[PDB]
Design a protein around this nucleic acid. Sequence first.
RNA 1: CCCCCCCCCCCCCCCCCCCCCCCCCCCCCCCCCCCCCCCCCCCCCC
Lengths: 659, 659
Amino acid sequence: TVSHEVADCSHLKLTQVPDDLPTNITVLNLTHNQLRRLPAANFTRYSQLTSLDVGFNTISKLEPELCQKLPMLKVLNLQHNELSQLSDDTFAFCTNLTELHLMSNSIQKIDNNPFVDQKNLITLDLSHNGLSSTKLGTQVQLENLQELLLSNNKIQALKSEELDIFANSSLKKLELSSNQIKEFSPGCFHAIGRLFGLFLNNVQLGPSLTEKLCLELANTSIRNLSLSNSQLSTTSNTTFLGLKWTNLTMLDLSYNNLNVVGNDSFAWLPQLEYFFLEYNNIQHLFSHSLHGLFNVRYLNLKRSFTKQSISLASLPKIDDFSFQWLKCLEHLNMEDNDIPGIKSNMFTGLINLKYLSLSNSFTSLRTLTNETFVSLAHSPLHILNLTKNKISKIESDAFSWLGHLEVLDLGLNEIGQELTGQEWRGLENIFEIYLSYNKYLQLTRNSFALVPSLQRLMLRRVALKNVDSSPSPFQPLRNLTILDLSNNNIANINDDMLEGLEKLEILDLQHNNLARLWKHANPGGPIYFLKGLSHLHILNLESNGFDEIPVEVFKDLFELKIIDLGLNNLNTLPASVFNNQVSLKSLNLQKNLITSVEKKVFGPAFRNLTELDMRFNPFDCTCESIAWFVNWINETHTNIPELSSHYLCNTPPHYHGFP
Amino acid sequence: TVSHEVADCSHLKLTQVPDDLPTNITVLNLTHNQLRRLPAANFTRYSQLTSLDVGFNTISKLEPELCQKLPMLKVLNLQHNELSQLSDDTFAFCTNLTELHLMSNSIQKIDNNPFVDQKNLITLDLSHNGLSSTKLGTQVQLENLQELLLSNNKIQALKSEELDIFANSSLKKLELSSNQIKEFSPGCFHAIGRLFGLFLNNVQLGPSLTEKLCLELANTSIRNLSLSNSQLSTTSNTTFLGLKWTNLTMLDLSYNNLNVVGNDSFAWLPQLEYFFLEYNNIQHLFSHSLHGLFNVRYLNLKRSFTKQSISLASLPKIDDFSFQWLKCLEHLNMEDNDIPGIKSNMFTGLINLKYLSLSNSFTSLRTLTNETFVSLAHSPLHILNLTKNKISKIESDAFSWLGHLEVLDLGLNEIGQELTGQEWRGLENIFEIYLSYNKYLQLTRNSFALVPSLQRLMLRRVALKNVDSSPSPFQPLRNLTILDLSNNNIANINDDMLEGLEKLEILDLQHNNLARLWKHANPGGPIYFLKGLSHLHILNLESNGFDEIPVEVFKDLFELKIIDLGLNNLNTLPASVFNNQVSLKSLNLQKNLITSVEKKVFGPAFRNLTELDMRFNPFDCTCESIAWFVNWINETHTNIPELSSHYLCNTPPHYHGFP
RNA sequence: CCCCCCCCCCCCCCCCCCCCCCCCCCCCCCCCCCCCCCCCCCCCCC
């Protein structure tokens, strides 16, 4: 029962409220308890409460005296309780309350007038209850109420008189989800003075009931409308006609199993701004299917189309000119589809597009020809995602039509080819290119020579070839910042590989084979491939097979902060290597063969750090090899994990395993 | 120039013979020298020589005085020299010689009588010379000569008078290989009193010349005849008619490119005993093709048939009943063929067969049905080799017709199935079964229950499955001796796996995964799967991932001699484990993580050995961990390899790498 | 001036074997989360 400023009593299995807490407590949490009853006589001590979070209990009934002991209470949380009876005196004396949760309270019926006398409520919750009608009063009250929740109830009708108690209130959210509503009375929503947002998730409406609902929703100020999982199989040109007279902006059609969309279906929403079609079953989209949507600014189409079936091969076809009417479209999420491929004229008309995500959108986009993105010629694209598309090859001038492209994501593909360098033609302002997890790439001396402005390059588990060319392919990228070359089994790197990239900061080189490149027995001497990068910050060199350290590799990283040498084969290290790393922060040397750590090699490294990772090391417990290290450990401030569990010696056997 | 009893001077680049050797030397070797001449005046000291091996020199001429200094000389070796002139006085005074090599001596012509006066020669060599005729005398001499070599010469004729100088000699071997002989004079071999063996390798005879030769070889005592690489494309029923009148037993037809054999071709050799057809190009063998061979006891057919060609698919077909006439056949080597498969009645009639090798004999013998070996019903087979036949499956009762089979070799196949146990039915006296290098085998509780007499089982890199069954499959083999279970990645073994096999001696278990089976943290305790084998001798347990040693596994191997624990992960070992191994001979503990070896654990192991393998061990140089070991090394007799190269410590750094 | 016979030394190519490092895939576990189901005990409501 820890309590300093807020009080929490979750998972303590209380029976009665504690009598020993600070008087000035503002937050009181008593979830996951067994309070059969809540007498108010124990609330005399607590006279400064603001929040009362006592859900997940078995409280039978409440008394008005509790309102006397809490005159400044703000939140009354009563989820999952047995308050099956409500009266006027139940919430009478409480008038300063602004929150009221009655979720899963098994309330049967509202009798006369339980909430009339108080007016400071902003949100009312009545979810998972046994209510059959929305009758919560007779006269008008709850002027300040804006959100009403009535989901998961047993309501089957919405009569006009029922909402008459909100004749002068502004409704931001009217939650009526999962209630088997089968009819709508005329004028029921016109009884609401100001209706802004409406929710009917998991409500079995269907086509005709949606027609009648839209006819009812006419001449109101609605902006939000969610009809998710309403089993709306088909829409037509008159489905949302009643929404012509309003100014709706956000509309949801997720999980509705929408098989087909009629022509000019959404012509009655000129003011729509957001529109959601995730997880549908569309088989064919027509040309004028999205007509009248010249103001949509955000469209989601994740898994909106039918998956391929071997019985019929019902591949979802998208006709040409289909997105012409989305003049102000600014975002298109188009993931997890089974579209056979891109046509020549699909995305014409998007004059203000800024985002297109195509992650796993196509079953077989084998080749990226130079005519694939011609429909994106005038669209000012900035981010393109081409992940998990099973793309096999990229031809010349594939992205030449993307003039203002800045981010390209080609991860998790099946690209096996040689980068001739003509792919990035026309990318005059490109910044990032992602190419991780491909089949194989064989770079060329001028692979990235066509894009000076590139700053990022992700090449993890891509299995590069000919990276050891005499001219360095990464040299022309005169402003590169992040480079990842992990999981590639790279064996040879040249000394002139990375000069001129003065702003390079992050270099990840884990799980490779550079053991030969650093041992002095290598012909021509060890390769010094980390020279010239003045502003490098993050370096990852774990699992390389390194057995020796050339003394002048880290001599130019004047601002290095994060270095990683785990999973290596290092046993002894030459002294005076980390001298110029004046501000090293994170050193990771786990799962190595290190047997002796001492000052003249790791002193400047241990100058001012923040994290050390030296978990699985066979240390030798000897004053020549461990004494200075344990001296450094004894007084320290570095965040070092698992020091008392895995920092165990190996030899001599007398001190085997003793920290 | 080391010389104790024999003298060797090979690869010393001598100019003249040494003058300082023991007088009683019997063997004198001076190969690979530059002796321009060999004066006899330096041979006064050497008066007890028996062998004179002075080949690979540049000796111009010899003098008869050398014979005076060596009266008991036996061997005169003069390969590759410039003795282009021979006379009667050249080998006159030498009469006790019994060996004479004149290979590659560039001898042009034999003038009058160089070898007449001496008679103790048994072998005469004249290979790689420039002789044009076999004239080596006028009268009769060389009564005791038995082998004559005349290969790689420029002889083009064999006249009858030419061999008249051997009218009363027994010729065991007449080597005339690679001489372009184009005619044969009648009576040339009848001039030889007793001709036994004849060689004509690499001689362009062809069919008709072979006919004439056989007609000439009539009425002689020949036994050996090699016609290898004679470009004999075709034979007929009368090819060897002249050999009817002799008693030939061994005949060679290797490398002759024999495309087809006529019917009843070998009907003229009732006394043949050995017969060689390796590396031929036979396309089709007829029924009566081997008629008249009822006495052949050893036949070689390695690569005797045509390989498959995609142009025509000329698969070599063997007709049925083809081996019926080989009544006394005792050995058939039948490797490296491209036979499509075995027919139902191929090997009938072999009443005394004892060996059939079928290594890589068939391109696609996918299934071993129960009717494959029906033709081998009455043949007393003892060894069968079925290696590299790409056999995919073995069905029930496949070897049921091999009543007296003792060895079965099924290695290097593609067998992926489950051994139901019915395969070995009828093998009432089987001893060894080899099954290494297969795809996958899944044993059954009664896989080997049908053959009590089995003694060997090779299962290397076979990837066994369900070896951890509750009843042990290897239990019924009540006399097993050798078991190999390497390269299988076996993970689980039961404690009741190998009881009752009291005579088991060799058990190889390398490159597996038994790390869990021995660590004490395993549920149920470590598995003691080596209990009961009283007479085990050879054990291989390298590369298993072992990290701990249960103390009572090697307690019953009272006669163990060879144990292997290399490539493991052992770091420290519990004491008193090798107590009962009173006669351990070979201990292999290379490439481990051992850091301390000392007496109470390895003392009884180091009692009386013969070989220790502890090459790559990270030792800890400390008197608690290395002092007793180096004490044991300092005085020893065990054959321990590479002690001064790889026995280097790891910690502390002061003694890193110092032996 | 030509053709051959060597001895010695230095390179190139191919094949085989062995060793080290690493990657990918798979197997045997062990651990931490997520979800579902079943069972036991206790406290209440209708």
